[PDB]
Amino acid sequence: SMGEAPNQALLRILKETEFKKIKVLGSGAFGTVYKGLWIPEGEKVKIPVAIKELTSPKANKEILDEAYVMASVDNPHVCRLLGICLTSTVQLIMQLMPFGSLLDYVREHKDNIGSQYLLNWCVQIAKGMNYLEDRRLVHRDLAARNVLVKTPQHVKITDFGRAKLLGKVPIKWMALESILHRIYTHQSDVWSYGVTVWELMTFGSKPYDGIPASEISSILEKGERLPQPPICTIDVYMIMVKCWMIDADSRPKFRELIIEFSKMARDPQRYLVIQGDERMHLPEEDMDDVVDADEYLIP
Ligand SMILES: CC[C@H](C)Nc1cc(Nc2ccnc(-c3cnn(S(=O)(=O)C4CC4)c3)n2)ncc1C(=O)NCCC(F)F
Numbered sequence: 001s002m003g004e005a006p007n008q009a010l011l012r013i014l015k016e017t018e019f020k021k022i023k024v025l026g027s028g029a030f031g032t033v034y035k036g037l038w039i040p041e042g043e044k045v046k047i048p049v050a051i052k053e054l055t056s057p058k059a060n061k062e063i064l065d066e067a068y069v070m071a072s073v074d075n076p077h078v079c080r081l082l083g084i085c086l087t088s089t090v091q092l093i094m095q096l097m098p099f100g101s102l103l104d105y106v107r108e109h110k111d112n113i114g115s116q117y118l119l120n121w122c123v124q125i126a127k128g129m130n131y132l133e134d135r136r137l138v139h140r141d142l143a144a145r146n147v148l149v150k151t152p153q154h155v156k157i158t159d160f161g162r163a164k165l166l167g168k169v170p171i172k173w174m175a176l177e178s179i180l181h182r183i184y185t186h187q188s189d190v191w192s193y194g195v196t197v198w199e200l201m202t203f204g205s206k207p208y209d210g211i212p213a214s215e216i217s218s219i220l221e222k223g224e225r226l227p228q229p230p231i232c233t234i235d236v237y238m239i240m241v242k243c244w245m246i247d248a249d250s251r252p253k254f255r256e257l258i259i260e261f262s263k264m265a266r267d268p269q270r271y272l273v274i275q276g277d278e279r280m281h282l283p284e285e286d287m288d289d290v291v292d293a294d295e296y297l298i299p
Pocket residue numbers: 025026027030031033035050052079080094095096097098099100101145146148158159160
C-alpha cells in the first residue's frame with residue numbers, strides 16, 4: 001500500500017422495516033434526528049437508536065462522507081455508525097444517547113454537576129480525540145454540542161461532517177491558523193478541545209458572548225483569550241491556556257491531556273472549586289430484549 005493502510009470497515013445496509021421511528025429528538029441546520037428502535041430480524045433483540053436525515057444530491061454526498069467516517073471508528077469515546085438505510089433520503093442509524101448533548105446537559109444540571117464528573121468528561125474527550133489522532137483523523141468541529149452523553153459517567157464525540165484525514169465555519173472553536181490560513185492539524189483540534197473544556201467549566205457559556213466572528217481573528221492576534229472560569233484553579237486554566245498557544249507544536253498533545261486530567265481526576269476538589277460539591281448525585285415498550293449498541297457486536 002503506497003500511503004494509508006486499507007480501510008476494511010463494514011458498511012451495514014439496514015432495511016426500513018427493521019426499525020421504528022418513535023419521535024423527533026431535534027431539528028436544525030445539521031438535519032433532522034429521530035428517536036427509534038432497531039429490531040434486527042431473526043435475533044430476539046431491540047436496539048435504541050438515533051436516526052439522522054437531512055433531499056438534494058450535494059446533501060447525500062455530505063452525509064455519506066459523514067457515514068464513511070462514523071463507519072470506520074471503533075472506540076468507547078467516539079460514536080460509531082450502526083448502519084445506513086437507503087430510502088429516498090439516506091438515513092444514518094446511530095446509537096441512542098439518552099441524555100443528549102453534553103452542552104445541554106451542563107446547562108440543565110448546573111446545580112448538580114461535581115468536579116469528578118467535569119474532570120472525567122475532560123479525560124474521556126481527550127481519549128476520544130487521541131484515538132482519532134491514532135486513526136490520522138482531524139475532527140475540525142470539536143465542541144460541547146458535538147459531545148453526546150450515553151450516561152452521566154460516559155460521553156462520546158460525534159458529528160464527523162467536517163472530519164478529514166491529515167460556507168459557514170465554527171470560528172469561536174477554531175485555532176488561529178485555521179481562521180487565517182485554513183490549516184487544520186490534530187493540534188488545531190487541541191485548540192477546540194480547550195474551548196470545549198471552557199464550555200464545560202462555565203456550565204455551557206457561549207464563548208466570546210456578544211463578539212461577532214469577524215472580530216475574533218484580531219482579538220486572538222492581540223493575545224486575548226477566554227476568561228478563567230470561576231470554578232477553575234490556575235492548574236486547570238493553565239492547561240486551557242496551553243491549548244490556545246499561537247505555536248501549534250507548543251500546545252499539549254491529546255495523550256498528555258489524558259494524563260494531566262486523569263491525575264487531577266484522582267483529587268478533583270484540589271483542581272475545581274464548586275460550592276456544595278459532595279452532596280451532588282446523578283442517575284413505552286417491552287424492555288426485556290433491549291440491548292444497547294455497545295453490547296450489540298457484529299462478526
Ligand atoms: C444533540 C444531538 C441530537 C439532536 N440528539 C440525540 C442524538 C443521539 N444519537 C446520536 C449518536 C451519534 N451521533 C449523533 C449525531 C450526529 N450528528 N448529530 S447533530 O445532531 O448533527 C449534532 C448536535 C449537532 C448528532 N447522534 N441520541 C440521542 C439524542 C437526544 O436527543 N437525547 C435526548 C432525549 C432522549 F429521549 F433521546
